């Protein structure tokens with residue numbers, strides 16, 4: 368059968384652009400001269416929380432799309448890509464006694480998706496419910512601030528002993544959200560961030576540029592790309608907690624072993640590193 | 654009985670460290686666990702005896718946590734037929750072999766996850782980040798494995814002298830990706846990490862190519878701190894150490910969830926600082 372692939376907007380792993388007038392993707396090229404492999408992905412345009420979500424065809428490309436294409440050709444399957452409806456990665460929440468998953472996790476479990484191809488963090492909470500591949504990307508957590516902002520890192524007193532003077536945050540219903548909610552010694556930070564968490568990484572990043580957010584805590588694979596691309600931003604403290612991205616599947620999936628073997632092969636034969644060279648970073652800054 | 658597992662490991666500090674059980678005393682000290690090692694009587698016999706030894710380290714600490722959390726007891730022993738694992742004439746030896754041929758329920762140690770091993774055993778989630786790094790004297794200019802001094806060694810006079818320890822996952826990778834480099838390297842094969850580090854500091858070797866986690870550990874405890882990784886820190890063929898299990902093992906998902914739990918609740922980072930804090 369045709370695999371329903373869910374993903375999420377997250378540069379440089381997934382770029383999302385409007386189709387052209389005729390409903391096709393504009394032919395574009397990479398920095399190294401290669402053609403950009405684009406696919407048609409349906410998803411909502413209006414991102415407002417609590418609003419109707421009409422799907423329109425759009426254009427997706429990037430690291431994770433190149434991975435999907437490779438996986439599709441390798442294991443001989445066809446796919447339909449769509450963007451997650453609520454725009455979240457996925458956490459488990461009380462409703463109420465009952466609990467539910469949201470985001471891409473929710474869609475994979477409900478059957479709306481057959482596979483998650485996205486910068487999706489592997490953790491205990493998610494692994495209880497779904498099957499992860501071996502990591503296709505080894506990374507961690509870091510902190511994004513505006514250039515000129517000086518903090519030591521995660522143990523800085525302005526984070527550990529917070530006030531309204533210095534605002535920091537992460538993304539709602541993400542793995543970073545789970546991370547600070549679980550650990551009890553991070554409880555003071557979690558209650559600060561809970562007042563300021565953003566709906567998406569792009570918004571939080573823009574908020575840091577606009578001096579509306581002083582510190583954004585997020586995936587380093589993403590934050591380091593942005594800091595290389597936007598010189599008014601920097602990362603500080605560097606990796607304070609390692610994590611990896613994996614392909615998400617139901618525990619029922621017949622693809623799960625061969626997907627993981629394909630990941631391992633791509634790490635070993637240099638294909639993942641070609642993707643890193645193409646998409647992850649290649650530019651500046653000073 | 655069903656929760657008493659045959660488990661194999663291999664010495665590689667700081668992940669697995671072997672100590673002589675001291676006589677008079679018969680026990681293993683507080684932070685170590687019993688491990689046995691089959692030692693031959695002579696070379697004209699198959700006769701041997703299991704010597705009781707004591708094991709400790711990062712991976713042993715991991716094994717204890719798993720033993721508590723997943724609820725199993727174990728009989729730990731040290732591999733004698735090869736090391737980590739190599740396919741020789743289509744037959745696995747080392748820790749991979751012990752599992753493949755069902756002499757062990759699992760293998761714990763500095764065991765690198767790669768594709769060909771994942772075909773004959775099941776691996777846990779990676780619990781230690783690793784891959785292939787390059788160790789040099791401080792200042793040495795090499796981009797990494799992809800550097801042309803490695804790729805096309807004889808394009809330089811004199812040729813760059815570099816080598817690895819054979820029969821492991823690092824050699825397997827180089828043989829498959831860089832055929833010329835590989836057949837050039839073989840003359841600079843090292844018997845083990847200690848030999849290689851000595852060859853570096855005495856100028857008999859220009860670079861040592863090996864497992865990243867072990868090299869990073871050795872860089873941080875080098876005297877003079879002039880032996881560094883080439884990144885410094887970056888890695889080729891990123892992967893991890895994993896617990897190896899028999900194909901279709903009933904212990905797999907419990908071990909996975911346990912390891913992930915350790916990561917999320919801080920226990921993993923504390924084992925890191927406990928066993929892998931360097932000076933450099």
Ligand SMILES: O=C(NNC(=O)c1ccc(CNS(=O)(=O)c2ccc(F)c(Cl)c2)cc1)c1ccccc1
Pocket residue numbers: 489490502505506608609610611612613778779780781782783866893894913916921925929
């Ligand atoms: O990598 C080490 N510890 N491991 C972790 O911090 C860790 C382990 C598991 C996970 C679970 N997610 S994963 O499988 O995708 C992953 C991500 C990054 C990693 F480095 C590893 Cl090993 C695994 C996350 C972090 C490490 C320990 C000592 C020295 C050098 C490295």
Ligand SMILES: N[C@@H](CCC(=O)O)C(=O)O
Pocket residue numbers: 737738763764765766818820821822823824863864
């Ligand atoms: N960790 C490696 C051994 C050292 C190496 O080959 O780099 C393995 O499991 O084979």
